[PDB]
Amino acid sequence: SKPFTVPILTVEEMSNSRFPIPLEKLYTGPSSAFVVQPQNGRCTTDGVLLGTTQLSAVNICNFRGDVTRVGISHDYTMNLVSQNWNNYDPTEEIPAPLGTPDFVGKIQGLLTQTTRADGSTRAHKATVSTGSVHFTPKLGSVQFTTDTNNDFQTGQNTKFTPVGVIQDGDHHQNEPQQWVLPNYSGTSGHNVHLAPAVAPTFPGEQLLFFRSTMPGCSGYPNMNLDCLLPQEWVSHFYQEAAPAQSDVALLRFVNPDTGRVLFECKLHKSGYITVAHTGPYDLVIPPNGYFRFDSWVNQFYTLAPM
Amino acid sequence: KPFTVPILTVEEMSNSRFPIPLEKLYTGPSSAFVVQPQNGRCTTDGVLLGTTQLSAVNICNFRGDVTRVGISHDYTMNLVSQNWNNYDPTEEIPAPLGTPDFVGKIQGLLTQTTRADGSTRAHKATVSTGSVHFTPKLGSVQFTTDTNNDFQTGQNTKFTPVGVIQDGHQNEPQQWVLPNYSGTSGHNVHLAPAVAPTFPGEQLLFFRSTMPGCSGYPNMNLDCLLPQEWVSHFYQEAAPAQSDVALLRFVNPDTGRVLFECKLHKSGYITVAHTGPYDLVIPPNGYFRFDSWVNQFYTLAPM
Ligand SMILES: C[C@@H]1O[C@@H](O[C@@H]2[C@@H](O)[C@@H](O)O[C@H](CO)[C@H]2O[C@@H]2O[C@H](CO)[C@H](O)[C@H](O)[C@H]2O)[C@@H](O)[C@H](O)[C@@H]1O
Numbered sequence: 001s002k003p004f005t006v007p008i009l010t011v012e013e014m015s016n017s018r019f020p021i022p023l024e025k026l027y028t029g030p031s032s033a034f035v036v037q038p039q040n041g042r043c044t045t046d047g048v049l050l051g052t053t054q055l056s057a058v059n060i061c062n063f064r065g066d067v068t069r070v071g072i073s074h075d076y077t078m079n080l081v082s083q084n085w086n087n088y089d090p091t092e093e094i095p096a097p098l099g100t101p102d103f104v105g106k107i108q109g110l111l112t113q114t115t116r117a118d119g120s121t122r123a124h125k126a127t128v129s130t131g132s133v134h135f136t137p138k139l140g141s142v143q144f145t146t147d148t149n150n151d152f153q154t155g156q157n158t159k160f161t162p163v164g165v166i167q168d169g170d171h172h173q174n175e176p177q178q179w180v181l182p183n184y185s186g187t188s189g190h191n192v193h194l195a196p197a198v199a200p201t202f203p204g205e206q207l208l209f210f211r212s213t214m215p216g217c218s219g220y221p222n223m224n225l226d227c228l229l230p231q232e233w234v235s236h237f238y239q240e241a242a243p244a245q246s247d248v249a250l251l252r253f254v255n256p257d258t259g260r261v262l263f264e265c266k267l268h269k270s271g272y273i274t275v276a277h278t279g280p281y282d283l284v285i286p287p288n289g290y291f292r293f294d295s296w297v298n299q300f301y302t303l304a305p306m
Numbered sequence: 307k308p309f310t311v312p313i314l315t316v317e318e319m320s321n322s323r324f325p326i327p328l329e330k331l332y333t334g335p336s337s338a339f340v341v342q343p344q345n346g347r348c349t350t351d352g353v354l355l356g357t358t359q360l361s362a363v364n365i366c367n368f369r370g371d372v373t374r375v376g377i378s379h380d381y382t383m384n385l386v387s388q389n390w391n392n393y394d395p396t397e398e399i400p401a402p403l404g405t406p407d408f409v410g411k412i413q414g415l416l417t418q419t420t421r422a423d424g425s426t427r428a429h430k431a432t433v434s435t436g437s438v439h440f441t442p443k444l445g446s447v448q449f450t451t452d453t454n455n456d457f458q459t460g461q462n463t464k465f466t467p468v469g470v471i472q473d474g475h476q477n478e479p480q481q482w483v484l485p486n487y488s489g490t491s492g493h494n495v496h497l498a499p500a501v502a503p504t505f506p507g508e509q510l511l512f513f514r515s516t517m518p519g520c521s522g523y524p525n526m527n528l529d530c531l532l533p534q535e536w537v538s539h540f541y542q543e544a545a546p547a548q549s550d551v552a553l554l555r556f557v558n559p560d561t562g563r564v565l566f567e568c569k570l571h572k573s574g575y576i577t578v579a580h581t582g583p584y585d586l587v588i589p590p591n592g593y594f595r596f597d598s599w600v601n602q603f604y605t606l607a608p609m
C-alpha cells in the first residue's frame with residue numbers, strides 16, 4: 001500500500017497552522033502545566049482533518065458575515081457566514097467554523113466591507129476578544145471593537161483579516177494564552193467535538209513544536225505561537241491519504257548537504273510529534289534541514305536523545 | 307517520476323498573488339494587454355520564476371526598519387528578508403520574493419515591536435506601488451500611515467496586507483500592469499515571461515479571487531496562473547516534463563464525469579478551448595487530474 005511521506009520543505013518555507021504567518025523555528029519544552037489541545041493544525045497522518053482544521057493558512061482566524069452596531073458604541077456584532085459567503089450551519093459536528101481561533105486572546109486586524117450595489121468600500125482597525133462572552137462562533141456570531149461608530153452598513157458582506165495580538169495590563173505577557181481554548185458557544189454550553197489533548201507519555205519525552213512569533217499590535221503581548229503540524233503537512237497528509245502501518249512514524253531530521261541525521265522524533269499517527277528531551281530548547285538546525293520518514297514503530301520506541 | 311497535480315478543490319487553495327483564498331475559475335480574451343504576473347510563476351518540473359516563493363502568507367508582506375519622512379505621516383522601510391536577514395539587490399530577481407506584481411494601493415497594518423521592553427504597536431498603512439518611492443529592487447518602499455510619531459527607529463517592523471483602495475470608478479488597481487521595481491532609476495529586469503495562448507481557439511484559464519476593498523471604488527479582481535499549492539507541489543515533486551504540454555481533465559468525483567479538459571503548459575500556465583468571457587460553473591468537489599503528455603497542436607474539446 002501507498003508509502004507514507006512527509007514534505008521536504010524546510011521549516012522557514014512552511015506556515016503556522018494556527019495563525020496566517022510563516023514558521024520560524026523548532027522548539028521543545030515542558031507541557032505539564034498546560035492542557036495542549038489546539039483545534040487548528042490537527043490532522044491524522046492518514047489525512048483525516050480534526051477539530052476546526054481546514055486546508056489553507058490564509059483562512060485561519062479570518063471571519064466573514066454581515067454586521068450590526070452594538071447600541072451606540074464602537075462595537076459590532078458579526079453574523080457569520082462560510083468562507084464562500086454561504087450560510088453557516090451550527091448543527092455540523094465540529095467545535096466551531098473551520099479556521100476559528102483556538103486560543104484566548106485579543107486578535108487585531110482590519111474589518112473591511114463592500115456595498116454591493118455601488119462597489120464602495122471601507123476598512124477599520126478592529127479587535128476580536130476570544131475570551132469575551134460575546135465570542136460565540138459555534139452559535140454563529142462574534143463581536144468586534146472597532147475604530148468607528150457609524151461607517152459600517154447593515155446587510156453588506158464584511159471580512160475580518162487578522163494581523164496580530166494585543167495586551168492590556170500591568171502583568172506583561174499575560175495574554176494571549178495560547179493553550180487555553182475559548183468557549184465556542186460562550187456561556188450557553190460547553191465545547192463539543194474537540195480534537196483530543198496531546199501529551200508525552202514515555203519517560204524522557206516532550207512535544208516538539210513548530211514555532212512562530214505573532215505580530216504585536218498594542219501593549220505587551222505574549223507573541224509565542226506553537227503548532228503541532230505545519231499547515232503544509234496538514235495539506236500533504238490530506239491529499240496523500242497514505243495508510244498508517246503502526247501507531248508511530250519514526251522521522252529523522254537530516255542535513256541534505258552532509259547527509260547526517262541531526263535528531264530523530266516520533267510522529268504519532270493522530271498527528272503530533274514527540275522527542276527525547278527535558279526542558280526548554282530552541283533546536284539548533286541548519287536552514288536547509290528537513291524531516292524524512294524512515295519506518296513504522298510503536299509508542300514505546302526509545303529515541304536517541306536529542 | 308510520474309507528474310501529478312494536487313487533488314485539492316479550487317476553494318481549498320490559495321491565490322498565489324495575494325494572501326487570500328481562491329474563489330472561482332474564469333477564462334477570457336487577453337490579446338489586448340500583457341499578462342506577465344511575477345508571483346505564482348513556476349514550471350511543471352518545479353523551477354520557481356519571477357518573484358515567486360513558497361508560502362501564501364508571505365505574499366505582499368514587507369519587513370524592515372522604518373524612518374519617518376520629514377515630520378509627515380509617511381515612513382520609509384529599509385527592506386530585509388522574511389527572517390530579518392539581508393536582501394541582496396544584486397540577486398538576479400526582479401525584486402524581493404513576494405513583492406507585489408501589480409500597480410495599486412495596498413492597505414494593511416504596519417506593526418512594530420520594541421525589542422528592549424516588548425512594547426508593541428499597529429497603525430493603518432498604505433503602500434502605493436505606482437509611486438516613485440516604490441523601489442523594492444533598490445531595497446526600500448514608502449508607506450502612508452495614520453501616525454506621525456508612534457513608530458520608532460531601529461526596531462523590527464512588518465506590513466501585513468489586507469486589501470486595496472481607490473481614489474477618483476474601478477480604475478485602480480491595475481492587475482496586469484507591473485510596478486517599476488526600481489522606480490524612475492531603472493527598468494524592470496529578470497521577469498518571468500509574458501504569457502499568451504498560441505493555438506487558435508484557446509484562451510488562458512485564470513484562478514480568481516476578490517481582494518478586499520478598503521476605501522473608494524477599487525477593481526478587486528485578482529487572477530493568478532497557478533494556485534499557490536501547485537507552485538509548492540511542483541517545487542517538491544520536481545517531476546520531469548515529458549513534453550511541453552500536460553493534458554488535464556477537471557473531474558467531478560461524485561460521478562467520475564469529466565467537466566472539461568485543459569492544457570497545462572510546462573512553463574506554468576493553463577489554456578482552454580473557448581472564445582469570450584466566461585465564469586466557469588464547477589461542482590464543489592471538482593478537481594484537476596493529469597492524464598497524459600501531449601503537444602502544442604492537440605485540439606481540446608470545447609470547454
Ligand atoms: C505599549 C504601547 O502600546 C500602544 O499604545 C496604547 C494604545 O494602543 C492604546 O491601547 O492605549 C494605550 C494607553 O493609552 C496605549 O499605551 C500607551 O502608549 C504610550 C505611547 O503612545 C506610552 O507608551 C504609554 O506608556 C502606553 O501606556 C502603542 O501605540 C505604543 O507605542 C506602546 O507600544
Ligand SMILES: C[C@@H]1O[C@@H](O[C@@H]2[C@@H](O)[C@@H](O)O[C@H](CO)[C@H]2O[C@@H]2O[C@H](CO)[C@H](O)[C@H](O)[C@H]2O)[C@@H](O)[C@H](O)[C@@H]1O
Nearest residue numbers: 113115119120121122123151152471473520521522523
Ligand atoms: C467610498 C467611501 O470610501 C471610504 O471613505 C473615504 C475615506 O476612506 C477617505 O479616503 O476619505 C474619502 C473622502 O473624504 C472617503 O470617501 C467618502 O466617504 C463618505 C462617507 O464617509 C461618502 O461616502 C463620500 O461619498 C466618500 O467620498 C469609506 O470609509 C466610505 O464608507 C465609502 O465607502
